[PDB]
Amino acid sequence: IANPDVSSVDYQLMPPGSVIVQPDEVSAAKMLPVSGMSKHIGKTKRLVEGDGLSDYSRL
Amino acid sequence: MKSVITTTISAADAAGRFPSSSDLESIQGNIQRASARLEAAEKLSGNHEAVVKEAGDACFAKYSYLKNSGEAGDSQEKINKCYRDVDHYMRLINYSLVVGGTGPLDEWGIAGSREVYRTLNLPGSAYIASFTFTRDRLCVPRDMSSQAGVEFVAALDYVINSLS
Amino acid sequence: MKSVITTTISAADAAGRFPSSSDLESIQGNIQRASARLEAAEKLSGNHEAVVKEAGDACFAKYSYLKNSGEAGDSQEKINKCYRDVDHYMRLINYSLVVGGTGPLDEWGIAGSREVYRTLNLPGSAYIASFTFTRDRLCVPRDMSSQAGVEFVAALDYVINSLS
Amino acid sequence: AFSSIDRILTADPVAFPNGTESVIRATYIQVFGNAHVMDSEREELATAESNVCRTGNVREFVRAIVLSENYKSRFFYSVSQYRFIELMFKHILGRAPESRAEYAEAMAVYNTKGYEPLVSWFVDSLEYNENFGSWIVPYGIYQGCYSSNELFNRSVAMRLAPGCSDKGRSAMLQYCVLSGDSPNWLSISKALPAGTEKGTGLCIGGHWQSSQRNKQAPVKGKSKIPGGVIVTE
Amino acid sequence: MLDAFSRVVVNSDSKAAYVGGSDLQSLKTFISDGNKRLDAVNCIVSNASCIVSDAISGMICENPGLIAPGGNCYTNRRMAACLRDGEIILRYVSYALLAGDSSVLDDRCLNGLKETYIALGVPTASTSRAVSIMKAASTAFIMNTASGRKIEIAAGDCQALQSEAAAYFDKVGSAVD
Amino acid sequence: MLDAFSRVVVNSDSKAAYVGGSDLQSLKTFISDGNKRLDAVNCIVSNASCIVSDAISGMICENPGLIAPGGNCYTNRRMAACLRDGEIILRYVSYALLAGDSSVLDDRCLNGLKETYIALGVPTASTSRAVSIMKAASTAFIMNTASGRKIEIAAGDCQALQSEAAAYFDKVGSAVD
Amino acid sequence: LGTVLGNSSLDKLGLDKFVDRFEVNEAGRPDGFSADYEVIIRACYMQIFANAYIMESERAEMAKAESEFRDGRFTVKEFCRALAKSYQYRKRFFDGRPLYGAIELCFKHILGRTPDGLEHYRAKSAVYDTKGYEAFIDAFFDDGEYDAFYDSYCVPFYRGHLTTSNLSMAAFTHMFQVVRGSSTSDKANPRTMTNQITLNQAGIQSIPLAVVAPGADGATFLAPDASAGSWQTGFSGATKARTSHGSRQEKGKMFRIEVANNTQYSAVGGGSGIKLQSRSGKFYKMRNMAPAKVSTFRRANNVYLVPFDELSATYIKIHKNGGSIASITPV
Amino acid sequence: MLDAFAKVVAQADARGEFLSNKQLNSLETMIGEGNKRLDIVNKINSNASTIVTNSARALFAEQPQLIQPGGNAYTSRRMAACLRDMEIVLRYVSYAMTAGDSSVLDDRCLNGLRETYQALGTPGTSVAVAIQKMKEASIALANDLNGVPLGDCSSLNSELAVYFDRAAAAVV
């Protein structure tokens, strides 16, 4: 669920270097195949193989 | 469910005889070709995910009219059914690959398919596009053993020639 | 070849009796609905060429991927086979329309079709696109008698429900 | 109004200020359809050609053509009044009638007065002035967000596919105007420009046929509340 | 173009009779609840761009094959025409809320839409899904239950009117299918 | 296997008299209502593919555990026997629409169907659900209120006949449960 | 065994060995070899005798017919006819049974369906009475049925279970009463035997029965018969009715449960080991606290009609008495 | 059991939707019909004994097989069974007339009635003739304008007739 309600991280107050942005795949063709299933875009990312289990039960 | 041992047991059963040396030679050949079949089964259960992913991606890479309108799949749900059906197919190729006859692939996948693909407006040529992509994709002596490759190609060809 | 009179003659023949008054009432209804059937046959033999032309043009209007590459209709010859096939179909609708049962349409067009369109990689959905275009685009009051239009639509619906 | 196909696919308007001969020719094809005029008819229209080589009132050019016997002969003498009014819409405005009321308006302006008042009625429409003015040759417009959807369907169906020539064909919009049923999807589909993916709707198949919208069919609607579904009828 | 008044008059026209009691009674119920209809149309109008944005963005995110190459949202021009159409649909629904009768929505936009989206190759599944998203978002704004905006109005029950607006959206989504 | 005629004749045979006036009068009403029944059977027969397809596909979409592995429809052949069964049910219903009496449907197909589907493992609820979808779609085609096919016939009243067809479908759906 | 495993219900219904097919693909004459024909010939005995035992000495009966099958004399249609007319087939199936049972067997042997309605019985009984035994057997074989389904070169198979024959739902269930899976022969099951006519009330009135799959316990029910009331005087005791009318429906839909093996040793009242009424051995139930010699369950196989809300309790009671459930059908 | 209302709620829960406004309008309509409905049920419950008695007289008069020795209604016991069965049929048609749904009449009486009358040797068609007589007498009694406010009751008599026709259809 993890949702903060009253919450804003400014990301303009940070020092000029320390805003880093990373894209999993830097391509057009591989972010979306012709068919619907996707591992990045849409709700289709929900249906990747793996990640079905959970490791937070250690608490 | 057809295999070596079910064909020979069912054949001698239809005869009315105990199993002579002929059936024993047949199951001897089963346990000769076994290692190549099970190697192919190990690698198929290894990377089934990426095989089905490349299969459907190339299937809509060929035919784009699938999402054109009602024909084929124009929604995320139908494409989910697409990748699920190719999951079933590779799972039956794994099963027939373990059994070593085309029995579970025939009775579960092939038998009475035509009424279903016909009635539910499913084109078979797109299935064949998926399988002929995966047929071509495997590289001889790059992963599985050369005979295992032969075993896998044979089974997949059976799927294609049974489809259309 | 199924019609009213062949069904009742074959039925009384399977019985082993002379045709009683029931068969006579059946062929009486044949010669009641006859005039609307033959009117529809006259107009179909009138403009078959424009009907088949609109049918194929809408069939490749709906489907365009037939034209590219491996798929049928790519070359001029295959598309000529396309309009020839729809010529056969409207000619069988004319024949069953004259006979008044689905007999010649069934035995000449429908019987054993599925192995042929399945084997020769021919999609049936394109045929249905052609017939549903020729089914949707007609006015009973304008170009046909009221009863005739019903008869024509009925025959054409039979074709569609026998196809896929 | 995005106007999706206005400049991307459809060719640009023939404005006046370029060479006169191209304006004259393009107006022949638009005002006429593919008429394919010959030597006699072009000699017969020479004084309008003079008036438009002189001043570029292409509005007055179109007026002068539609008043001439070459246009009157074909369309007002071989052709029946239903088709006459409809073609008049197509030749002058580029577009079809959007409703039965407007078609009744044009027919009424005919029957009260005559031919010339009708022609001046098309040429003096405010809609015609905003689309074309005095300086731009008529053409088919892709506005987007039209007043009626039927305006788009009838307009495209009556703007024929390349190589039109209404001299063979018969009137497709009379039952369509009076009934309010929009034309066949195939004729609409044939007339669209290239790259519009002509008629890849028409969902046909074992499942989801839905080939003809049916007015009388009852209306159903389902929404999902955390309890379950509300169907509103 | 007929409002609720013209519907009562046209129906009374067929029998060639005066308005009478009962039809005027239902029309009295129309007039009394007019402010609720007024503020309802104000709610759907004063958020409308944002409804269209959220609905079409949701339509793409539910079905990511539209933005896939080959889909009907794949280009900028196709996407512009897409946003344009959603805006038009919400416009005529707003007109149908002011009128109280769906004659305007039937004569302007709905008539000849299936044939248009057939002609252009637009997908039915995408069209009806986007309409349904505008339906739910619109009724959520009309009950003042939006999770992003809660504006101040006088309290009152408005079940009827929300069912009416849901009936217009179901008319559009049923019309494209 | 008896229609309305055979029913009247057998009942008047157990009564042991001549046919009589009242029986013949009701049968005159049957024959005078003949062509409506003709056109009705025409409608349901010339929509067989859609009725079976939509019905069973709706049965799967309502209850998606049929298609899950271990369900009746999971096997490919099972799906074909499923579609065949839907087709046959629709077929005998069309026969009962012709005959005017359900004797054909009761003696042929309805008799022992429950115990067959019990013995094979078929869930009764899914089938009842499929028969109900065939009912609603079949009455919508018989009343020309289908949402994508609107054929022209002369207008009239066929409410009686719709209730008749719905009675045969309710006979089947009540017969499997 | 069951339904769900293997994605095929019909294997597990006991029709596992009946799927194999035999046709003579060899045209002309067989000289020297005699493997393939002896296989087909064996399947003809397995079909027409329905797995009945033929001794080596007996094989000398029908040896002429057998030496004419091997030659170009008899198609297997006509060889099957020759096996059907001979003294063997008369002794087993015709002479032992009443005329009606004989008919039903002749369908199990020749056509492989059951009779569905009384009229099929009308046809065959009529032909027998007019013309005798040979015309009876011809009337099976000389019909459009056999010719269409088998085409004269294929050995008969059980098709009564199959959807393709129109039959009746009744004839499907009746089909499983007549065929009990591989081991059961013609007289192997009860309900056929020699003097029994198998299903008569069932086959005549097209009462669809129920299916108990063979095995998995409760394999035998052989449910008790009912009489017909004051007219055609009957005993009302023995069986629950197939119907369940109103007044008890309330409380859920009615289920007919058939319990199969009921015995004294099995019946314990829920607690293991047999109850001893007296200190020393008197194991029957004390009636009025005085010793009785009447068994607790008096016929094996009693039935229960039980509404839904009472199912659980009844489901417990059966298993209290160690009875085993054959089948449960909603009624 | 199902009553108009129960059937609509039961279906609406079997899909798990709420009731649309359309359904609620229909419900309200049937209620507004409901006084007349209770009037028909009152008529039938009153004169029921004369319906059964007279209809049995006409049954045995038109078919004098059953009163003779060896006929099916020949014994004191079997006669009483015969009359009581007629009273059963008339009872449930009165029930289904109240409920507005034909479910009670099917589930309690008609569904499986033929299996019984086969199983007993009772001629089914003779029962059908008897139910036709109760239909004649009951409708002609239901359309009596005695003691009651005037209006239109054609639809309710139509419905009632449908129930009896279903009874004679279910025995035959």
Ligand SMILES: *CCC1=C(C)C(=O)N[C@H]1Cc1[nH]c(/C=C2\N=C(C[C@H]3NC(=O)C(CC)=C3C)C(C)=C2CCC(=O)O)c(CCC(=O)O)c1C
């Ligand atoms: C191709 C056949 C067809 C044409 C043509 C047409 O206009 N519509 C269909 C027939 C049709 N179907 C219904 C009713 C229902 N159909 C379904 C099945 C679908 N609903 C689903 O959720 C799914 C799975 C995603 C499917 C396949 C259902 C559930 C109904 C409503 C059932 C009910 O209880 O009412 C109708 C009647 C409605 C209408 O379109 O007017 C028709 C004509």
Ligand SMILES: C=CC1=C(C)[C@@H](Cc2[nH]c(/C=C3N=C(/C=C4\NC(=O)[C@H](C)[C@H]4CC)C(C)=C\3CCC(=O)O)c(CCC(=O)O)c2C)NC1=O
């Ligand atoms: C054991 C093996 C096995 C299979 C191989 C599948 C085959 C299969 N697919 C579907 C059903 C389906 N299959 C597809 C798939 C397609 N979508 C398209 O765009 C393409 C043409 C194609 C993928 C290449 C779709 C879309 C459906 C649903 C069709 C519909 O409901 O319209 C169904 C009907 C039941 C269902 O809806 O799931 C079945 C039996 N099922 C099995 O049990």
Ligand SMILES: C=CC1=C(C)[C@@H](Cc2[nH]c(/C=C3N=C(/C=C4\NC(=O)[C@H](C)[C@H]4CC)C(C)=C\3CCC(=O)O)c(CCC(=O)O)c2C)NC1=O
């Ligand atoms: C279970 C069956 C199964 C297969 C059959 C393979 C098929 C397969 N091959 C590759 C992937 C690959 N396959 C090849 C092979 C080729 N090199 C060439 O020069 C030839 C054209 C061809 C051998 C004949 C190469 C080179 C890659 C890597 C491609 C790349 O990263 O560019 C991938 C993507 C994942 C990966 O990088 O490994 C997959 C799924 N994988 C499986 O799980």
Ligand SMILES: C=CC1=C(C)[C@@H](Cc2[nH]c(/C=C3N=C(/C=C4\NC(=O)[C@H](C)[C@H]4CC)C(C)=C\3CCC(=O)O)c(CCC(=O)O)c2C)NC1=O
């Ligand atoms: C008596 C009735 C009757 C018919 C209905 C036809 C049906 C038919 N069509 C083909 C054969 C064919 N039919 C088509 C037609 C098609 N091209 C496409 O792009 C579309 C999918 C489709 C038109 C709508 C084509 C292309 C072939 C040749 C296929 C090939 O050789 O690849 C054949 C095989 C023999 C041949 O090559 O001609 C047959 C039997 N023939 C008959 O005798």
Ligand SMILES: C=CC1=C(C)[C@@H](Cc2[nH]c(/C=C3N=C(/C=C4\NC(=O)[C@H](C)[C@H]4CC)C(C)=C\3CCC(=O)O)c(CCC(=O)O)c2C)NC1=O
């Ligand atoms: C043998 C059977 C047979 C038919 C059933 C018809 C079907 C048919 N109609 C048209 C053609 C046509 N059909 C109509 C009819 C319509 N006008 C409308 O307002 C309604 C939607 C509809 C009447 C209900 C119209 C208007 C055209 C001309 C369409 C056009 O040119 O735009 C054409 C093309 C050739 C032509 O222009 O005539 C054909 C084949 N022709 C045949 O040979």
Ligand SMILES: C=CC1=C(C)[C@@H](Cc2[nH]c(/C=C3N=C(/C=C4\NC(=O)[C@H](C)[C@H]4CC)C(C)=C\3CCC(=O)O)c(CCC(=O)O)c2C)NC1=O
């Ligand atoms: C309705 C009546 C009517 C007329 C009387 C003419 C008059 C006329 N002539 C010209 C135009 C012209 N007229 C002439 C004629 C001449 N060449 C010479 O050597 C001589 C002096 C003279 C013939 C005696 C020429 C040459 C032009 C073209 C002038 C130019 O472009 O330089 C124009 C301008 C438009 C055009 O270029 O055609 C007009 C209006 N037009 C009409 O509509």
Ligand SMILES: C=CC1=C(C)[C@@H](Cc2[nH]c(/C=C3N=C(/C=C4\NC(=O)[C@H](C)[C@H]4CC)C(C)=C\3CCC(=O)O)c(CCC(=O)O)c2C)NC1=O
């Ligand atoms: C008065 C009412 C009225 C309407 C309702 C619209 C309807 C409409 N939309 C388009 C045209 C269009 N409409 C869309 C919209 C879509 N994009 C998608 O991804 C979805 C399926 C869908 C939004 C839900 C698109 C993409 C086009 C352009 C199609 C193309 O050019 O390929 C056109 C053709 C003209 C144009 O290009 O603008 C028309 C008439 N126009 C009107 O005048």
Ligand SMILES: C=CC1=C(C)[C@@H](Cc2[nH]c(/C=C3N=C(/C=C4\NC(=O)[C@H](C)[C@H]4CC)C(C)=C\3CCC(=O)O)c(CCC(=O)O)c2C)NC1=O
């Ligand atoms: C020109 C534009 C214009 C508007 C947009 C409205 C806005 C508006 N609404 C009300 C007044 C009202 N508006 C509503 C409406 C509501 N009922 C509820 O349950 C919901 C929260 C909400 C509908 C979504 C109600 C109930 C009142 C009366 C409030 C009261 O008297 O308690 C009033 C005060 C005058 C009156 O009582 O009518 C005004 C100005 N009026 C206008 O002139």
Ligand SMILES: C=CC1=C(C)[C@@H](Cc2[nH]c(/C=C3N=C(/C=C4\NC(=O)[C@H](C)[C@H]4CC)C(C)=C\3CCC(=O)O)c(CCC(=O)O)c2C)NC1=O
């Ligand atoms: C051999 C096949 C065959 C048919 C299929 C029918 C078709 C048919 N129906 C009608 C005639 C009719 N058909 C209907 C039926 C309808 N009522 C409605 O509410 C629905 C739209 C529709 C049922 C689904 C009606 C009402 C009439 C009479 C129309 C009228 O007189 O207004 C007529 C004209 C003659 C007549 O009045 O009977 C004909 C030929 N007749 C045949 O001979």
Ligand SMILES: C=CC1=C(C)[C@@H](Cc2[nH]c(/C=C3N=C(/C=C4\NC(=O)[C@H](C)[C@H]4CC)C(C)=C\3CCC(=O)O)c(CCC(=O)O)c2C)NC1=O
């Ligand atoms: C004359 C009337 C008549 C009928 C009504 C049918 C009834 C019927 N269905 C099946 C057989 C079948 N019927 C179904 C149907 C089902 N699939 C499901 O997912 C649902 C529960 C259900 C559709 C609603 C299936 C799947 C089979 C095959 C079962 C199996 O082999 O496992 C069989 C056994 C023979 C066969 O395999 O075809 C029979 C008799 N047959 C008839 O002759």
Ligand SMILES: C=CC1=C(C)[C@@H](Cc2[nH]c(/C=C3N=C(/C=C4\NC(=O)[C@H](C)[C@H]4CC)C(C)=C\3CCC(=O)O)c(CCC(=O)O)c2C)NC1=O
């Ligand atoms: C809850 C609903 C309900 C019913 C509807 C009845 C139906 C019914 N009737 C009988 C039984 C009977 N029913 C009749 C009636 C008939 N006599 C004839 O001459 C006519 C054909 C027919 C009256 C029209 C007779 C005579 C018997 C006794 C049959 C016999 O014993 O021979 C029985 C068997 C038990 C018994 O003997 O009573 C049952 C279940 N019982 C119920 O519980």
Ligand SMILES: C=CC1=C(C)[C@@H](Cc2[nH]c(/C=C3N=C(/C=C4\NC(=O)[C@H](C)[C@H]4CC)C(C)=C\3CCC(=O)O)c(CCC(=O)O)c2C)NC1=O
């Ligand atoms: C508790 C017991 C009980 C009853 C027995 C009824 C009796 C009854 N009936 C009506 C009312 C009515 N009853 C009938 C019935 C008739 N239609 C005719 O054609 C026939 C003469 C007759 C059926 C045999 C009609 C038509 C009305 C409405 C009369 C009218 O409004 O004109 C009313 C007035 C209230 C109303 O309109 O419903 C009452 C109290 N109500 C009860 O509460």
Ligand SMILES: CCC1=C(C)[C@@H](CC2=N/C(=C\c3[nH]c(C[C@@H]4NC(=O)C(C)=C4CC)c(C)c3CCC(=O)O)C(CCC(=O)O)=C2C)NC1=O
């Ligand atoms: C990842 C692809 C994706 C989207 C895009 C969204 C789109 C979306 N918005 C919804 C519904 C929705 N959307 C809004 C409007 C929106 N919210 C606000 O508070 C403001 C200011 C808005 C415009 C900026 C509202 C008000 C609702 C109603 C729910 C709510 O209370 O927030 C719903 C629910 C539909 C329903 O109830 O049937 C969806 C699916 N969902 C997705 O999965």
